[PDB]
Design an enzyme around this catalytic site. Sequence first.
Site, PDB file in Angstrom:
ATOM      1  N   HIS A 131       0.949  -1.041   0.231  1.00 17.21           N
ATOM      2  CA  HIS A 131      -0.115   0.144  -0.209  1.00 17.21           C
ATOM      3  C   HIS A 131       0.685   1.273  -0.082  1.00 17.21           C
ATOM      4  O   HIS A 131       1.920   1.195   0.506  1.00 17.21           O
ATOM      5  CB  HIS A 131      -0.839   0.032   1.310  1.00 17.21           C
ATOM      6  N   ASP A 174       2.097   1.762   3.341  1.00 15.85           N
ATOM      7  CA  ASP A 174       2.952   0.844   4.115  1.00 15.85           C
ATOM      8  C   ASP A 174       4.504   1.205   3.701  1.00 15.85           C
ATOM      9  O   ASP A 174       5.305   1.009   4.526  1.00 15.85           O
ATOM     10  CB  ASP A 174       2.700  -0.636   3.523  1.00 15.85           C
ATOM     11  N   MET A 215       2.962  -5.652  -8.012  1.00 13.77           N
ATOM     12  CA  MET A 215       1.649  -4.946  -7.574  1.00 13.77           C
ATOM     13  C   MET A 215       1.846  -4.141  -6.429  1.00 13.77           C
ATOM     14  O   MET A 215       2.470  -4.358  -5.654  1.00 13.77           O
ATOM     15  CB  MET A 215       0.644  -6.149  -7.666  1.00 13.77           C
ATOM     16  N   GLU A 267     -10.235  -5.981  -6.102  1.00 14.12           N
ATOM     17  CA  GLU A 267     -10.393  -7.184  -5.073  1.00 14.12           C
ATOM     18  C   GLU A 267     -11.654  -7.170  -4.489  1.00 14.12           C
ATOM     19  O   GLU A 267     -11.990  -6.328  -3.522  1.00 14.12           O
ATOM     20  CB  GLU A 267      -9.176  -7.061  -4.013  1.00 14.12           C
ATOM     21  N   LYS A 280     -14.804  -8.170  -1.624  1.00 13.07           N
ATOM     22  CA  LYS A 280     -14.972  -8.699  -0.294  1.00 13.07           C
ATOM     23  C   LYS A 280     -16.312  -8.395   0.056  1.00 13.07           C
ATOM     24  O   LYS A 280     -16.937  -7.234  -0.069  1.00 13.07           O
ATOM     25  CB  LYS A 280     -13.902  -7.900   0.533  1.00 13.07           C
ATOM     26  N   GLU A 310      -9.717 -13.032  -3.503  1.00 19.82           N
ATOM     27  CA  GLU A 310      -8.934 -13.823  -2.261  1.00 19.82           C
ATOM     28  C   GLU A 310      -9.710 -14.837  -1.868  1.00 19.82           C
ATOM     29  O   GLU A 310     -11.002 -14.865  -1.875  1.00 19.82           O
ATOM     30  CB  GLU A 310      -8.869 -12.514  -1.160  1.00 19.82           C
ATOM     31  N   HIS A 329     -12.270 -14.130   1.055  1.00 18.79           N
ATOM     32  CA  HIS A 329     -13.222 -13.361   0.909  1.00 18.79           C
ATOM     33  C   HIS A 329     -14.455 -13.993   0.151  1.00 18.79           C
ATOM     34  O   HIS A 329     -15.554 -13.789   0.592  1.00 18.79           O
ATOM     35  CB  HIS A 329     -12.811 -12.026   0.175  1.00 18.79           C
ATOM     36  N   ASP A 349      -5.024 -13.483  -4.359  1.00 22.06           N
ATOM     37  CA  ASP A 349      -4.645 -13.385  -3.152  1.00 22.06           C
ATOM     38  C   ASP A 349      -5.000 -14.603  -2.537  1.00 22.06           C
ATOM     39  O   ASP A 349      -5.944 -15.085  -2.361  1.00 22.06           O
ATOM     40  CB  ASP A 349      -5.528 -12.573  -2.392  1.00 22.06           C
ATOM     41  N   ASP A 372     -12.854 -11.724   8.550  1.00 21.83           N
ATOM     42  CA  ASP A 372     -11.782 -12.340   7.657  1.00 21.83           C
ATOM     43  C   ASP A 372     -10.636 -12.871   8.474  1.00 21.83           C
ATOM     44  O   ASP A 372      -9.780 -11.797   9.334  1.00 21.83           O
ATOM     45  CB  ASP A 372     -11.511 -10.931   6.881  1.00 21.83           C
ATOM     46  N   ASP A 401      -7.699 -14.274   7.309  1.00 18.34           N
ATOM     47  CA  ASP A 401      -6.471 -14.153   6.795  1.00 18.34           C
ATOM     48  C   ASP A 401      -5.310 -15.322   7.207  1.00 18.34           C
ATOM     49  O   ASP A 401      -4.378 -15.027   7.655  1.00 18.34           O
ATOM     50  CB  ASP A 401      -5.936 -12.812   6.703  1.00 18.34           C
ATOM     51  N   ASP A 447      -1.883 -12.998   0.976  1.00 16.30           N
ATOM     52  CA  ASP A 447      -2.516 -11.917   1.788  1.00 16.30           C
ATOM     53  C   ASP A 447      -2.910 -12.477   2.811  1.00 16.30           C
ATOM     54  O   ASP A 447      -4.050 -13.023   3.339  1.00 16.30           O
ATOM     55  CB  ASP A 447      -3.813 -11.097   1.069  1.00 16.30           C
TER      56      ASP A 447
HETATM   57  O1  LIG Z   1      -5.662  -2.683  -0.662  1.00 12.39           O
HETATM   58  C1  LIG Z   1      -5.410  -4.175  -0.904  1.00 12.39           C
HETATM   59  C2  LIG Z   1      -5.493  -4.694   0.357  1.00 12.39           C
HETATM   60  O2  LIG Z   1      -5.895  -3.927   1.412  1.00 12.39           O
HETATM   61  C3  LIG Z   1      -6.072  -4.515   2.619  1.00 12.39           C
HETATM   62  O3  LIG Z   1      -4.833  -5.070   3.015  1.00 12.39           O
HETATM   63  C4  LIG Z   1      -6.984  -5.824   2.743  1.00 12.39           C
HETATM   64  O4  LIG Z   1      -7.022  -6.214   3.952  1.00 12.39           O
HETATM   65  C5  LIG Z   1      -6.489  -6.613   1.694  1.00 12.39           C
HETATM   66  O5  LIG Z   1      -7.598  -7.692   1.411  1.00 12.39           O
HETATM   67  C6  LIG Z   1      -6.188  -6.271   0.251  1.00 12.39           C
HETATM   68  O6  LIG Z   1      -5.488  -7.004  -0.547  1.00 12.39           O
HETATM   69 MG   LIG Z   2      -6.526  -9.147  -0.259  1.00 11.33          MG
HETATM   70 MN   LIG Z   3      -8.783 -11.162   3.854  1.00  9.07          MN
END
Ligand SMILES: OC[C@H]1O[C@H](O)[C@H](O)[C@@H](O)[C@@H]1O
Ligand SMILES: [Mg+2]
Ligand SMILES: [Mn+2]
Lengths: 387, 387, 387, 387
Positions: free
Chosen positions: B54, B57, B88, B181, B183, B217, B220, B245, B255, B257, B287
């Site tokens: 991200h 991050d 990615m 993605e 969810k 994912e 999800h 994912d 969730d 994970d 993920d």
């Molecule tokens: O924005 C992408 C990621 O955002 C957050 O980490 C979500 O928990 C995850 O599901 C997703 O892959």
């Molecule tokens: Mg994910």
């Molecule tokens: Mn998840």
Amino acid sequence: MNYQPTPEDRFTFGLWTVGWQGRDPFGDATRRALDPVESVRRLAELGAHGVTFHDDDLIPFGSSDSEREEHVKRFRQALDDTGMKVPMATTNLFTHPVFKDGGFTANDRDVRRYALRKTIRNIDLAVELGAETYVAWGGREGAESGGAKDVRDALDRMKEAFDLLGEYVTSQGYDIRFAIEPKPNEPRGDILLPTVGHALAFIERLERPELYGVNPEVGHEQMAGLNFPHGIAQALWAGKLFHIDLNGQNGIKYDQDLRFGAGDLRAAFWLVDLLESAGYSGPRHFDFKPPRTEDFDGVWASAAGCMRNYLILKERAAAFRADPEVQEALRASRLDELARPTAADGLQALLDDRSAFEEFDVDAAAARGMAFERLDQLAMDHLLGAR
Amino acid sequence: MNYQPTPEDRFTFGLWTVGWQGRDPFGDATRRALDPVESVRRLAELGAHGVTFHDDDLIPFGSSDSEREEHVKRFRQALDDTGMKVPMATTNLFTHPVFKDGGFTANDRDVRRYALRKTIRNIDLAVELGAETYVAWGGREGAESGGAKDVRDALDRMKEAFDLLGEYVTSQGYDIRFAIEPKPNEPRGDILLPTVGHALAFIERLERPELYGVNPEVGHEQMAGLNFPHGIAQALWAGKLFHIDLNGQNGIKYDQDLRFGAGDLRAAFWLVDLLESAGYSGPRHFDFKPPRTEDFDGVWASAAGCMRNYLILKERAAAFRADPEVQEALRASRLDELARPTAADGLQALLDDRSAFEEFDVDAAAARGMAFERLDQLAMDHLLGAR
Amino acid sequence: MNYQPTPEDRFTFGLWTVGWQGRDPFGDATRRALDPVESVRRLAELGAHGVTFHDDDLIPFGSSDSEREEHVKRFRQALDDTGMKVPMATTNLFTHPVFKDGGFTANDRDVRRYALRKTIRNIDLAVELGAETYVAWGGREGAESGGAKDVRDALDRMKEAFDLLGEYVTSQGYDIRFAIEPKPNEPRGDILLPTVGHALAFIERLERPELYGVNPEVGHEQMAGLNFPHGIAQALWAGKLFHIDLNGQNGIKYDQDLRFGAGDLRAAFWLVDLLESAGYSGPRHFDFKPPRTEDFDGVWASAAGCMRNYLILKERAAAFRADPEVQEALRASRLDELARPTAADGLQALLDDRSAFEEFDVDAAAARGMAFERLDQLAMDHLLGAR
Amino acid sequence: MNYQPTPEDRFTFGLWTVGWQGRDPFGDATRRALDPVESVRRLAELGAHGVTFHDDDLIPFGSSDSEREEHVKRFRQALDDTGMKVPMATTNLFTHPVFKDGGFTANDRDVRRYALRKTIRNIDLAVELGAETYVAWGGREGAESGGAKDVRDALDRMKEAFDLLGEYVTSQGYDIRFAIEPKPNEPRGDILLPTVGHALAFIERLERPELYGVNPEVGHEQMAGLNFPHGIAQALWAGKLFHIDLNGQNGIKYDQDLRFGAGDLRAAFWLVDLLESAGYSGPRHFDFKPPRTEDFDGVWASAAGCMRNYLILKERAAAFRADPEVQEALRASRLDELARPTAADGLQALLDDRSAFEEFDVDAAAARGMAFERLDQLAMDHLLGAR
Ligand SMILES: OC[C@H]1O[C@H](O)[C@H](O)[C@@H](O)[C@@H]1O
Ligand SMILES: [Mg+2]
Ligand SMILES: [Mn+2]
Ligand SMILES: OC[C@H]1O[C@H](O)[C@H](O)[C@@H](O)[C@@H]1O
Ligand SMILES: OC[C@H]1O[C@H](O)[C@H](O)[C@@H](O)[C@@H]1O
Ligand SMILES: OC[C@H]1O[C@H](O)[C@H](O)[C@@H](O)[C@@H]1O
Ligand SMILES: [Mg+2]
Ligand SMILES: [Mg+2]
Ligand SMILES: [Mg+2]
Ligand SMILES: [Mn+2]
Ligand SMILES: [Mn+2]
Ligand SMILES: [Mn+2]
């Protein structure tokens, strides 16, 4: 009393709904079979607009041409006697043992061809009875194990079947359209096109996508824990809500098919609010089962309850939207801003807009409450008649 | 020992996965924050191919240009030191309070514009680091109440945001593609585009649909009780599996994970069988969250377990498909017939084919067992190494 | 080959399992009915230890005394011919329409009395055939609506029925015990005593609690999203695991009754590990349905798969527990400390122990990793045969 | 307006409810922390009866004795200023990292001892503030993997902890009682004592069972798909409903903690009907989270909504039960027969009663409709104010 349905309300019922004898996986029938004639008459008396049918609901499987003609003749006379319509019909591709591995996606090719011929036969009959929508529910398309079905192959076969059906109605000059009814599971462990989204995405790969929409069912999306009004909204957004199945369901479990309004009452309220505000003009079709605890009279009270509950929720949702205090709360929550274009000024203007990033006061925006709870309590007060 | 990953295996990890400090809704952090540099080094040592991030991050939110440059410089030196790639990247549109009602579909228009500018900024950075896919996870797009979000309006805003992002990458000549993605819920009560199907259907209404795919994912789709290998198959059928994912999840609940292979082990087996047999060539991205019971060493054992479990399942699925006894069972179950066209002879030939209806022996077909259980037990024996 | 069951393994099957004709709520039967004699013979050939029955599986409902005698005579000769036992029996209080609102908790008092008399009759027969356990599955005890059943009243009636049944077996000097089989829903919308816990709690209010235990089923607890090995552990802790039903289930949905090992494979592994390590000595009873896609031969392959999968998991769990590296990991995770008394020194010593509070180094304890992931990957490697 | 709460209504709120800052697993706080003093004042203004607390809500963790005294002093002055009570308190055994593997069932023995000492300290404080109930929520007692927790050992440790706590309150002469709050999952993958039933069964093995009851939460039983009014009924039947947590939840997913009345509205109606008709006299405690979209004013509107919704449902349920037409429908459905003993004439009379079996007209009984749907539609009309 009050909340009296009339055929103008477009309420319709499957022959298989009030006609359900009460057989479940653990129990024998609790009611005798109904003549479709009597169902048409009893529903018309309740204020219904029409009925729908599986081929095998109206004509018993394996019937001779002579019997077929007489069954249709009697049905036609019941519609003429009552004024009831037949807006939709569908094929039973799930009861006969031959469909145990599916209809259009059965591994056996000869079963797939038979399933198509069985459907084509019923499309002709449905058009003769005036149906505008032909529903396909692939209840047997799926698997209980991972090796049993290659899903890509099965989607190839599913696309071929729907393309062929579209080629057929085009070749006859029929105006009827197709609607996919999704369901995530049961009777198969997992069913192909399990939700509204999966069906919408599938349709976009068909040869003539404009011929096909969805027939979403309240309980089926709730069987996957999904928000049914959200799914309906995406179907409306795509222009694909050709038909709808109304009933009730208590969360993630077997397909309950409770009368509409039972199950998730608030989701029913938001559904009716959406259907009315979007101006949905199709049939309000109930795909429900009078519980097998009920006798013949309980069947009709259950059917009457479906319609009554729709009409109550319709009144409350309309009062909610017309309330000036609600209209002010909706502005307070910025639902008016949600409806405005994010960037009608275009990409380059957005990129140069320093108020969108370099000088955006992110903390002042974050501190702005959405006021969603006061809005939701207004909705609850309206639903409950506690204003 | 055995089942040793190498970068050729394309295993990738989010910085937020092994870097998760262990904060959950009921608990404070159990581990110190990780420098992304050390994560890159530790993952490379385990055999990973690369990492994903991200924006927030890699560069702490609110960083100055000078700090931004130094954070990227250090990250770049870690990739150069290890050979790790960045296939990615994605935008954090969910942590900051300003996104409490969403990013692209926030009711407040100025938040929507800010969300787009925040994403566009990170697309530039991701391209510089070599990313081929940009992931959008609309975790805040949704609602806890029915009046708070008009979903049709929100889908209008969502389409506008993705169209603008597509206009941007086109205008820069970037080769990067977008992956949605899905969810179904959490952190919002219901999330827009809740499943693979809903995202696939949404993409077909975008201005440049070829630019957009899905990043499904495991957990999800399982959070909605759906069959993840089925959803992947429909994504592959549509040509839209741009990214994936991998993780684990025990059914319908929050969730989780879990590391890949935990959760639904058999679904993991059928997923790996599908990805390998379809020739999926994208990153095998994990993920997952090392459970907060684990210390620093437990984090790396968890990451190593993800890769090991993929490699074990890959071996077993391949042995399953190569087994002559399995190949014979697949013919016995007519998986070869599932792959043949239902009606290559055309509609009119199907209509005149008396063996498809008038002379179809429906009882003989129905009596034909599918032999799915013997096939599934062969799959189980292969999975377990009990042949 | 390998993993060959023998009657010493105590594998048992309901007549209703391999005898299931394939009728589901949406489908007609796909297989002919089986003579219980042939089922006994085919199961014995597979290595089964015995069979179980509903009264109405062995003697068709409404049978005359003469027919009853001849049905039992033939069944008895099949057991004598094979060596098969009958460790458990149960009453069908769910198929006949008269039980549509329940058996023991039917609102109609005369139905409740009939249900008790029907059960008492079958207890006599089960004792004659050697059954040690009599199972009660209140599949019809429940409701689809809130006004239909006062649950406190219904629990009063349920307690009265079980107390009467306990008074009866005491008055005949029978050694047979009762086991409640919980299920959360289906065929009723919600079923009374929905889980192992609810049944255990209910039993503690019966007049003679020592006579009653639970018969938990894998799929039934998983239908509520619960951890079945956890529920079994609490049943064992209470000393109430009188019987168990083994099968497979994919999460929260309709009751699938897959063969054991299908569904949640890892939960099956931990279940077998618990049953063997606790020394469960009762029948390993399979309550499963050969999927209706299967023919007669597929039925027996499915039954054989149940036993084979138990035996594979038994071997792997035993190898897991005997592995010195696993034994060291279990110490690393402090499973040995979990088994030690928290405060054998007594309350007052705990209150004066400054190392338990005033001088407890809470941060040093918190920083101690549990090493659960390395332990779990060892379990996975053992399950998969990848050590 | 209307439906105005007063302290006589016994409405209580956790300090952690209206005080929730909005941190979720994916988001930073959206609201500033609240002084417990201001919460007491704002709740009293809304008509609340009292507040509840975790030790660490009222006194920040690690506080000195001097700070502890001043925090309690200020809290006490707020209660005196308002008239608010403190009917219940509880220990935070879940937030600090030291509890990452549990409190009473942590594998580490020294953590278990610390958890007991932390609880005992807070019991003294709760008694000083007048609490009648001490709640234990073992949110960290559980596991994400099967090898990490031997559940039988963990139940041994759980029994030891509760027995010690019972020995302590007995030794001080305190009148306070304990209530177990079950939850099936989150934050652990599976939580021990996952439902009301499991907690009720556990309590029956404690040394002094009369000291312990349950504190069931609407959303927690619904997180397992269970019928919360049914679970409450079994708790009342056992005499163990010491406390209750009211909130809302949309089916099986993460713990939502919506305000009461949101979520499953009809289940809320049947719950209120049961609590009032059973004469539940304990606190009506709301364990909810104002959604993080809300600002400070939205917090109080959400709290006010909880109370208002209880009062509306109370009025409608009472009107339902007092309605002569409903009273006649209840007789029509034989709810009066459900409340009569099945066999007050005794076992031997039942065995000789030919009308209970040999001459029972099973078909005439089966043909008797239960009339449940007309009863349920009467309940719906009453709920909606559409009579
Ligand atoms: O924005 C992408 C990621 O955002 C957050 O980490 C979500 O928990 C995850 O599901 C997703 O892959
Ligand atoms: Mg994910
Ligand atoms: Mn998840
Ligand atoms: O084929 C259309 C209909 O088939 C069956 O009746 C299904 O139960 C129902 O969901 C569907 O509407
Ligand atoms: O009555 C005992 C049996 O009844 C039915 O067969 C149920 O489906 C099964 O779960 C149970 O074991
Ligand atoms: O310890 C008691 C309380 O702890 C936490 O606040 C839980 O979220 C809540 O469910 C419970 O009532
Ligand atoms: Mg339907
Ligand atoms: Mg069973
Ligand atoms: Mg609570
Ligand atoms: Mn349905
Ligand atoms: Mn079952
Ligand atoms: Mn909660």
